[PDB]
Amino acid sequence: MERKHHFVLVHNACHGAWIWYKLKPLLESAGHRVTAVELAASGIDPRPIQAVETVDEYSKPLIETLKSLPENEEVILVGFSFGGINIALAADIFPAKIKVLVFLNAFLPDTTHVPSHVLDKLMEMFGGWGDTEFSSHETRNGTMSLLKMGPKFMKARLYQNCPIEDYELAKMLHRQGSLFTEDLSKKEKFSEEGYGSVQRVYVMSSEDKIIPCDFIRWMIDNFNVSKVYEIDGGDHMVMLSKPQKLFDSLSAIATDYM
Amino acid sequence: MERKHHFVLVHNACHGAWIWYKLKPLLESAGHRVTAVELAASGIDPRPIQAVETVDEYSKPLIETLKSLPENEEVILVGFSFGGINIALAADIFPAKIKVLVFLNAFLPDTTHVPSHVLDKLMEMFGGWGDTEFSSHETRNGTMSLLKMGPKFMKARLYQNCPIEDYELAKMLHRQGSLFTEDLSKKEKFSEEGYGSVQRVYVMSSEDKIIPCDFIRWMIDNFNVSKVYEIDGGDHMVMLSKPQKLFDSLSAIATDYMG
Ligand SMILES: *C1=[C][C]=[C][C]=[C@]1(*)[C@](*)(O(*)*)C(*)(*)#N
Ligand SMILES: *O(*)[C@@](*)([C@]1(*)=[C][C]=[C][C]=[C]1)C(*)(*)(*)(*)#N
Numbered sequence: 098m099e100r101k102h103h104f105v106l107v108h109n110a111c112h113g114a115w116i117w118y119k120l121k122p123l124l125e126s127a128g129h130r131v132t133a134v135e136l137a138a139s140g141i142d143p144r145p146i147q148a149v150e151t152v153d154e155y156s157k158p159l160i161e162t163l164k165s166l167p168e169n170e171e172v173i174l175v176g177f178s179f180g181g182i183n184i185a186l187a188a189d190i191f192p193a194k195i196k197v198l199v200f201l202n203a204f205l206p207d208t209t210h211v212p213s214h215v216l217d218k219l220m221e222m223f224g225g226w227g228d229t230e231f232s233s234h235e236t237r238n239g240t241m242s243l244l245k246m247g248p249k250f251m252k253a254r255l256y257q258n259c260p261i262e263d264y265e266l267a268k269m270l271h272r273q274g275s276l277f278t279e280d281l282s283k284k285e286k287f288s289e290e291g292y293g294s295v296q297r298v299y300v301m302s303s304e305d306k307i308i309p310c311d312f313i314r315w316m317i318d319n320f321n322v323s324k325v326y327e328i329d330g331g332d333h334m335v336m337l338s339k340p341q342k343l344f345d346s347l348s349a350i351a352t353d354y355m
Numbered sequence: 356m357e358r359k360h361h362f363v364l365v366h367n368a369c370h371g372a373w374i375w376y377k378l379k380p381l382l383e384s385a386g387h388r389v390t391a392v393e394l395a396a397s398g399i400d401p402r403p404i405q406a407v408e409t410v411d412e413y414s415k416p417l418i419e420t421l422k423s424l425p426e427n428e429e430v431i432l433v434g435f436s437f438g439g440i441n442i443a444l445a446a447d448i449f450p451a452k453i454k455v456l457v458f459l460n461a462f463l464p465d466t467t468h469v470p471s472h473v474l475d476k477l478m479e480m481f482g483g484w485g486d487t488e489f490s491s492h493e494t495r496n497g498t499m500s501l502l503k504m505g506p507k508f509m510k511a512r513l514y515q516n517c518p519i520e521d522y523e524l525a526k527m528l529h530r531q532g533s534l535f536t537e538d539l540s541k542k543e544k545f546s547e548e549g550y551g552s553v554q555r556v557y558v559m560s561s562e563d564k565i566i567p568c569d570f571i572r573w574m575i576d577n578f579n580v581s582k583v584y585e586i587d588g589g590d591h592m593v594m595l596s597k598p599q600k601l602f603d604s605l606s607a608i609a610t611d612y613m614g
């Protein structure tokens with residue numbers, strides 16, 4: 098009996114813990130423990146995104162999850178898409194609780210530029226927003242940029258390799274959210290002693306039509322990882338299009354940090 | 356090419372439109388149109404159940420769905436569990452917009468007794484609620500009873516024939532809700548001219564551990580339906596445990612109500 102791990106899963110913006118519904122039982126059937134976090138104003142969280150003005154407030158459920166682990170427990174901390182920013186923020190707080198960070202089709206921030214850097218780059222490059230709806234909301238500390246995916250955009254750019262039932266599920270659960278670009282432009286840089294110090298790996302899907310493979314090299318060039326894993330045939334929503342293969346990669350990761 | 360229909364699907368308490376994620380594409384593939392209503396304080400609706408103090412506010416998204424339909428359109432209205440109550444309520448308002456009511460694993464109220472009658476009767480005899488959490492919320496109508504399912508109760512009594520992924524989904528998404536039994540016990544009886552006038556059928560799952568098949572016979576004995584369909588092996592959450600069979604029943608229904 099090889100030693101099992103505690104995986105903490107962190108969803109993407111505009112989604113919630115539900116995205117993990119296929120992966121969670123897989124990992125649990127192998128003996129691992131799983132905590133799928135629901136971030137603020139996400140999923141069935143009762144707050145609107147407008148009430149959650151900062152990335153720290155957005156991430157607080159994940160900080161609380163880690164704070165509540167018993168003394169000396171460490172987890173494998175998986176961040177998906179914007180979830181990469183969330184787990185970098187957590188790692189800067191609780192580095193000794195994290196065995197390894199798994200950046201899954203994720204923004205991988207560095208300790209040199211402002212925290213928004215990798216998001217601002219993608220936003221300059223990306224062309225295919227489609228029917229996504231962009232809006233603002235003024236807060237007492239400045240404009241907060243909001244977004245709500247449109248269904249055609251979802252289909253073409255996030256869910257194109259998923260079963261149709263998954264796409265219908267997503268249409269009934271996705272919500273307006275934010276990438277907190279303003280807030281993250283004003284935040285202190287991520288630290289070397291906290292986030293920098295934690296082991297990290299990247300897991301990319303070969304057919305991610307939102308986080309392209311050149312943009313990943315660019316992020317990794319800019320901030321190195323231990324190892325890159327590739328999921329052959331995954332769309333951006335890889336826990337839905339290729340859950341078994343994702344399990345396989347996570348299981349490999351767990352073996353390299355036994 | 357036979358004429359296809361517009362199905363309006365209404366979820367159960369403590370759930371949401373998401374429950375229909377498997378059945379929706381089956382119906383759409385077959386050429387039908389599908390609206391899966393998200394009721395108040397349900398699924399991703401932004402209000403807590405404490406803000407939804409009556410069954411009429413609970414049901415308002417469905418009423419609004421029917422109100423918005425173009426002139427002369429009629430729908431196959433499907434109500435699941437507590438969704439039977441909701442579709443009865445809607446048929447008392449827009450009876451001419453409904454081709455047929457489909458009571459799926461559902462409460463089938465009558466026009467003789469108070470609207471809560473059939474729930475009160477199950478509540479009398481109901482098994483064990485397991486790890487379900489009950490709370491009371493005070494309102495300008497008096498006390499509202501709230502319930503939040505427990506995960507053991509879910510697994511045993513609602514989801515026992517569902518794939519484990521679907522029980523995990525539901526753990527991620529279920530919410531505190533209400534059966535509105537106080538509000539329903541005070542409300543005007545459903546009318547014969549409205550609700551009573553609409554065509555109705557029943558579809559039951561043979562392994563429903565919440566709505567047992569004797570109680571269903573009792574409801575149908577007390578308020579007749581045109582046809583009864585059974586889904587062999589379905590648990591309560593039949594749209595997740597046997598979506599294809601459910602689609603087969605709805606398809607048979609639709610064959611009976613093309614004009
Ligand atoms: C409804 C009615 C009686 C017991 C349990 C429920 C539950 O909310 C469902 N479906
Ligand atoms: O909301 C999407 C997204 C798209 C572009 C950039 C960041 C996030 C996801 N996940």
Ligand SMILES: O=Cc1ccccc1
Binds near residue numbers: 220226231
């Ligand atoms: O805020 C509007 C916008 C539009 C296209 C790309 C990025 C932002």
Ligand SMILES: O=Cc1ccccc1
Binds near residue numbers: 489
């Ligand atoms: O509706 C409240 C209640 C409480 C205990 C048992 C059964 C029902």
